[PDB]
Amino acid sequence: GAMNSSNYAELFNNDIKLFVDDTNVYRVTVHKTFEGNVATKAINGCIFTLNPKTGHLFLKIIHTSVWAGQKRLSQLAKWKTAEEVSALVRSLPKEEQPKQIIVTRKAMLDPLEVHMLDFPNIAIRPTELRLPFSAAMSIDKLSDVVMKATEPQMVLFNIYDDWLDRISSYTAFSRLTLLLRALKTNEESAKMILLSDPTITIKSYHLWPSFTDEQWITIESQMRDLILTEYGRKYNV
């Protein structure tokens, strides 16, 4: 069934599972036309498919050519997402296939269920967590690969860098969600908190800076302050 805060530790047990977020699949800019009407222009998107235990991210880049000459693009995007997740599962060896796929938006349930009929033992579930995965495109190296793509492409990342050498997957996911929530709430300020100290850098093969354990405590506290600050500005508190 649904996934929430009561069964939160289930994300870090030994049953393979993937989160699928479709927020960034169909992305557009809205603009005026010469005649004063409004038009959309699509830009490249991505499917965010994440294993929360290992940090493995299957980023399928959605190139704007997939929309050419198609109708009802917001509906099509859900079915394209489900098509691509199904193709990913079929490409994995049996012992790597998930036992559960958790979708961040309930509108993905029927498209994914229909594309996965051949896998009746893979559970397709919603979640009551409000997960900030839309902010993935605020991670510079992810945004760069998506915008430079000239054709469909799958790129593999570990979204936890090397953190699991030092912390549990529960703690790593909690850190990721806090970082993404901060980037979603005030991107510029979060990026400034993450990059202000120039002596701490991002390794070529990483997504985030090489903070020590104590520096991650400081960063996490700065991110929580940013979020609370923004909540106060929003609601006049």
Binding site: P111, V114, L117
Partner: protein
């Protein structure tokens, strides 16, 4: 015209014959139903006065044999039986008719209601949904489950309706997932009509039989099947015009006949609002839409 005599009526019971019903008192001198129109299937159904649990009844066709009803005090119900001795049968019926111990099937001459509800229903198809090959008539009751219900538990006592499931491999061609899920025309025309039912008349017959079992017995799985067969047509972009026009007639007379006070339990709001107002065929059911809006506007 044909006759279904009763040996007797030892327990108080409401007796239905098609869309008609009447009450018989405990040990009243009731000996059956006469003037039953030849040319249609019929259903004779029962609800005991002292225990309204289990509505039950029998589908039959007087052209296929001489049938009578007798109460079984061991199993506690009125049973249909066939009499093979033709002259005994006529002799019994004549005694009962001469003493005016039968009610008359009360058909008004202007009235096509029963034909309109059973136009596509044939006994041979009933006997494949309800499997009891030793009898020419078919028993149905309120609690009987369907094959689909039993997959999601005595198979000998089940309603073998054709399984319809919109999220099944039968309904969805590999490679046509979005197409087939949003437009059920493949499933309707190739899988169901060409493949399983062979023609629209058999499809409508099963739809009409499902409705009648839901209405007369309160059989829940029958109601599910009736709604699924409507939704399958309405959710298809490509349906032969003659089928759409016939479906409008079929549903109009079903909605016309439904007891007003049974609507909360016999009509699925989601299915009807989808079919009348959102589906491909939302503008193809003019007669049904008009009666639904004037008779059950709350549902919508």
């Amino acid at each position: 015209m044909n006759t279904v005599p009763f040996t007797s009526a030892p327990i108080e019971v409401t007796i239905g014959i098609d869309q008609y019903s009447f009450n018989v008192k405990e040990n009243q001198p009731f000996h059956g139903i006469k003037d039953i129109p030849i040319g249609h299937v019929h259903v004779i159904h029962f609800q005991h006065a002292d225990n309204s649990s289990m509505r039950y009844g029998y589908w039959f066709d007087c052209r296929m044999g001489n049938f009578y009803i007798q109460y079984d005090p061991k199993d506690g119900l009125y049973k249909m039986m066939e009499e093979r001795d033709g002259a005994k049968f006529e002799n019994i019926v004549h005694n009962f008719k001469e003493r005016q111990m039968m009610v008359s099937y009360p058909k008004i001459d202007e009235d096509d209601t029963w034909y309109n509800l059973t136009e596509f229903v044939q006994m041979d198809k009933i006997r494949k949904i309800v499997r009891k090959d030793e009898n020419q008539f078919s028993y149905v009751d309120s609690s009987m489950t369907t094959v689909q219900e039993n997959e999601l538990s005595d198979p000998a006592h089940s309603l073998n309706y054709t399984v319809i499931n919109f999220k099944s491999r039968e309904a969805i061609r590999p490679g046509h997932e979005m197409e087939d899920f949003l437009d059920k025309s493949y499933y309707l025309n190739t899988v169901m009509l060409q493949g399983i039912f062979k023609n629209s008349s058999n499809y409508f017959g099963e739809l009409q039989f499902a409705f009648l079992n839901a209405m007369f017995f309160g059989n829940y799985g029958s109601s599910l099947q009736w709604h699924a067969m409507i939704e399958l047509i309405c959710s298809s972009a490509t349906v032969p015009k003659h089928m759409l026009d016939k479906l409008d007639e079929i549903l109009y007379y079903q909605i016309k006949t439904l007891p007003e006070q049974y609507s909360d339990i016999l009509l699925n709001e989601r299915v009807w609002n989808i079919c009348l107002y959102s589906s491909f065929q939302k503008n193809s059911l003019h007669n049904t839409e008009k009666i639904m809006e004037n008779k059950y506007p709350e549902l919508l």
